[PDB]
Amino acid sequence: DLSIWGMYQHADAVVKAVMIGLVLASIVTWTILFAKGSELLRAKRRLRREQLALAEARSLDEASELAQNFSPESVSAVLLNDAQNELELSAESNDNNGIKERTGFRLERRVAAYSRNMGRGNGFLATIGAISPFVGLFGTVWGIMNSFIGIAHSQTTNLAVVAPGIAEALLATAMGLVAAIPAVVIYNIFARVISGHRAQVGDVAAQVLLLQGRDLDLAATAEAKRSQHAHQLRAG
Amino acid sequence: DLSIWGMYQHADAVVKAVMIGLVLASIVTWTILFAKGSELLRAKRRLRREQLALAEARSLDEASELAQNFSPESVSAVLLNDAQNELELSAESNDNNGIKERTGFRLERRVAAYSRNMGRGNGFLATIGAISPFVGLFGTVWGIMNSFIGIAHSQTTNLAVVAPGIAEALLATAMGLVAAIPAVVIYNIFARVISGHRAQVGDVAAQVLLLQGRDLDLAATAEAKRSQHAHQLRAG
Amino acid sequence: DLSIWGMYQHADAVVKAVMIGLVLASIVTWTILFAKGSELLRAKRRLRREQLALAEARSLDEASELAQNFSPESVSAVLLNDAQNELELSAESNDNNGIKERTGFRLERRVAAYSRNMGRGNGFLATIGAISPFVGLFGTVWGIMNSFIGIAHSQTTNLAVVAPGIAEALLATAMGLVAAIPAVVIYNIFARVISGHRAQVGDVAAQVLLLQGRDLDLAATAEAKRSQHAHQLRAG
Amino acid sequence: DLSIWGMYQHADAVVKAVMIGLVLASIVTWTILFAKGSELLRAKRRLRREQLALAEARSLDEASELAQNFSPESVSAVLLNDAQNELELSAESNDNNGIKERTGFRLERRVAAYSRNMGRGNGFLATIGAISPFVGLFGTVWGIMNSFIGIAHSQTTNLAVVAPGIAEALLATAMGLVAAIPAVVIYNIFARVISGHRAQVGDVAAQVLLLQGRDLDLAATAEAKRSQHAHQLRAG
Amino acid sequence: DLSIWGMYQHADAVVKAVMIGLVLASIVTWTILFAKGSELLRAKRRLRREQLALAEARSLDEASELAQNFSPESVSAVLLNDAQNELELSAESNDNNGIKERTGFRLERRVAAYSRNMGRGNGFLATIGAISPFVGLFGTVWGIMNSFIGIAHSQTTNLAVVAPGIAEALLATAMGLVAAIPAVVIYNIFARVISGHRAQVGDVAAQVLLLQGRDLDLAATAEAKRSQHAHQLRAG
């Protein structure tokens, strides 16, 4: 009558509350894994295809033309629209260093927002893996405390009577560790994957800033080369 | 006579001091939650309305006109007044890169001050969730130490006499964990929410710096275009 | 004979050394509090008065005139002398962006030095609150180890003889926690206050950099406006 | 029958699963050491030879000529090709500050990628050294819990029967510490070595940015000196 | 026969290996202290003398003349040679902002290298203070595990026989704490001192960058003032 289910239904009210809290923490842990690791791996494999497509680009217009047929909910099309949007909001503004600083500002704001939305379940995983051995420890401290209350109320010296109480308490601490260890492991995996992915988003943003800077620079050079002849037709 | 209230009033002076200290830590924990989480959520929903209002702005003057009817104790009106204030303190100063660097300096100072005032109760929550299992542990170490003193003073070997002492001690450590676990959980929640909100404040500050930079840039361009005709009337 | 003083004088040599080490850690903890929290609060209330005085300044010369009557060992007068000192070391240097970058460099060096001298006792508080439960744990491990040596040397089975040994050991671990918990609490308080104060010092430094930048900018503008007439009298 | 192998085969199903999980964590620990510490030391000794070769360089063309005969899978040739590649992508772009900012951008992206690929096994080592005492602790908690279930099912008071159960449990926690301690030690070693190596990669990148900046600067100076004679033939 | 040396020679093979590993960790701890704290304090007192000598400098040439008679293995002479070396490598390069950015780049690379070579033993101290209570804990877990094996092999119920086993185990954990606590204390001391010293090296580097920037600025100004007369003799 002392199986893993046997011990749970033979437990106290507070110990059962601790145990179903730890089981719900485990359900949330594995659900965060199978429902956001799937989205993370899908987004990694999507940005890899977009990164390989835009890796042959030589201007921002070729990158926008290659990004016309990307996914609707992508990243590279969002960053390319920010760069191009800034180029049209700052049209009839001749300060190209301004456009570069403002685009770098919008893209680091956008990359920061994207990377923040990536790690949503990380707070849950960090809190579960941090507090779950304490919730299991509270379960076993309450179990042993009720065992000592049961040994003080009734003058009973032997341990074969108070042993299922100690076993239920220890079950609560074991379940605490079972809810804790995938929390930390999955958190670590996610941290690695998310850093990989935020390096990819930073790489695509880098690419957009280098294609916009190179275009602005080359355009400014051609314009200068044509305007020198006008300068020497005006100052003469 | 050994209920949760029964054990407290049957405890020592130091153990009762530990227990009411942990209960006051729990009262402060839940009061920080229900009285600053309310202010944080109110400020989040207020900056969201102001962010949606100013998201259609094309200059700093349209943003100031849309922000004239904002809340008195807002953020977006404060940041917009810093930007506009700098524009009038640095009137008759032709260095526009200067105004942009000084406004970015004032706004990062203001955003830093606002974000510092946001996390006020965080020090309390971090200290309570860090030291509360130690205060519970001091309570149980003193409980077992007084139990061993009671077992050394009177030659009493059985455990049915010294068991309420050990139970009171264990109550102190359980209460330590109950004061500890919402401290860490609420700290984590608050950290997430506060990062969300400090990203929103950073976004509004970003917007103000991009509307002021774009205006200064466009103005400098128009002024330059008009002064070229004066240049060719002066240098001829 | 087993009071808190009774147990100490009835202890071993190593256990008494652990206990007076923990009492000296507690004396240092409360002395760091009452002798540097007083200096921190005095400096906070002094920089608040200087911040309110200089908040009505419109140039660096008005700020220096208002800071002539400040405290000798202040901060705002030191930072204002750095700014003004740089303005006279870089006299007959026409590069104003140079003066701004060099002043920002000296002031961040000075602010860093001031903020480093602020947190002096923080290393003591962090080390005491980190190692003090370990020193208490070493005391109780040596106490129980000597208790087991005493139970192995003399074939004595009952616990009413070996109980004051275990109580002295547990006293060492309780004293470890008492020396540990104000170390962490006071460290946290100090960290908060010191961040508050280093934000104030950063605000005053910010003010000095914005008053020096605005003055240099406005001066450069007036000089340019006067030199344009000389330019058009020279190039004609 | 209670040797280290004797205890394992006499254990439970969950305790044996814990033990082979800890042995596989130890195999992965020592394999990460002997198969990536070898690659790290090989890469350190290779970048040292390339650093000594390029330390006598005075331009980017001499560094490229000395790097023609480097290893195929090197670092210095990759960074030198980025610098030279940027110099040819931004050919017919006269903004040299642009080329310097874009090269610094590509090289910090490349250095970041290289340093990220260096620390691959670090996530494994950090997770193993963090969760391995907990997996050993889960093993011993399950061992003692099954021991108490065995002492509650059969009314058996003496400890000479339940002692191999407690010994198997303790074996699981010792094995937990054995899988944990080389995880942290090797992680620390690797962290040191990887910081050493990422300082070397940062030094080579620094060198490439200083050779490209000095060349661009010196070229711009010579070009300016020749164009001054053309200026006085155009403005005359 | 149960003195501190008595217990060690009466121990197991694994427990003696744990104990001599902890004694060698203690020897390394105190040797890192007395052989690198001496070098740190010598370097602190040497940079203080050089800082007081160069604090009266008004150019980089006066600082080089005052640094000609410094120690051979110093810091200030190294940083001053970097600044002067850059000034001669970038001779016949008129871009002074270039020289300032490249010198700041070399000096932050050099300061980073010096500060990295300062904290050599820090990895040893951090690893010893982190893993040493675990190595002591492995020693006591193996000691109690062998005690339970000895109580399971021979049906022996009393504790006066198994007590030296538990005492040897506890000795291993006490020695673990003795090797651990100076590791953390000395690490903390070193961290403080090294931050003090890396602030001094940063201050000297700051000084070198401010003396080189001021010299370049003042030179550029004088050159401009002389070249204006040539400009008005050329453009006339």
Numbering used by the authors:
A (entry chain E), B (entry chain A), C (entry chain B), D (entry chain D), E (entry chain C): 46 to 281
Sentences from the paper on this structure:
ExbB and ExbD are cytoplasmic membrane proteins that associate with TonB to convey the energy of the proton-motive force to outer membrane receptors in Gram-negative bacteria for iron uptake. The opportunistic pathogen Serratia marcescens (Sm) possesses both TonB and a heme-specific TonB paralog, HasB. ExbBSm has a long periplasmic extension absent in other bacteria such as E. coli (Ec).
The 3D class average model clearly showed a pentameric structure. It was refined and polished to obtain a resolution of 3.1 Å using the Fourier shell correlation (FSC) gold-standard criterion at 0.143. The periplasmic N-terminal extension did not yield any visible density, precluding its structure determination. At the C-terminus of each monomer, however, density was clearly defined, allowing structure determination for an additional 10 residues in a helical conformation up to the last one (helix α8 finishing with Gly 283) before the His-tag that is present but disordered. The cryo-EM density of ExbBSm shows vents located at the interface of adjacent monomers and at the height of the cytoplasmic junction with the inner membrane leaflet. Additional density was also clearly observed on the external surface, and we attributed it to the phospholipids present in the preparation. However, we were able to model only one PG molecule per monomer with confidence.
